[PDB]
Amino acid sequence: EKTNLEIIILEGTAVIAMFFWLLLVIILRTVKRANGG
Amino acid sequence: EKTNLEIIILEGTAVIAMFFWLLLVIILRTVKRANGG
Amino acid sequence: EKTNLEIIILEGTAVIAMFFWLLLVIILRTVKRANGG
Predict the structure, then answer these.
(1) How are the domains described in the entry (chains A, B, C)?
(2) B19 vs C: CB within 8 A
């Protein structure tokens, strides 16, 4: 019943921290893939 | 050793709740992008 | 304060186990989509 609390902070921080990563990942990839002509 | 249990419900609910979201997200986008001609 | 520890193993194993899956998923799709000419 208590663990649930962690499930909320984990479920959110999970999909959250992920998006944050996949975000800077797409940006870094979008940039590196823009140094060409 | 016990926390693991939560890791199973979290690991699953994590990738699960995620797909569920990205799912209704692609559907809502696929629909809104289908109201045109 | 302690739960955090699990948040580290969960947050990582979360985005980790995920990539691992989406990985073998893209590979299987990349392969099946390579048996053609």
Answers:
(1) The second and third Ig-like C2-type (immunoglobulin-like) domains are sufficient for VEGFC binding.
(2) no
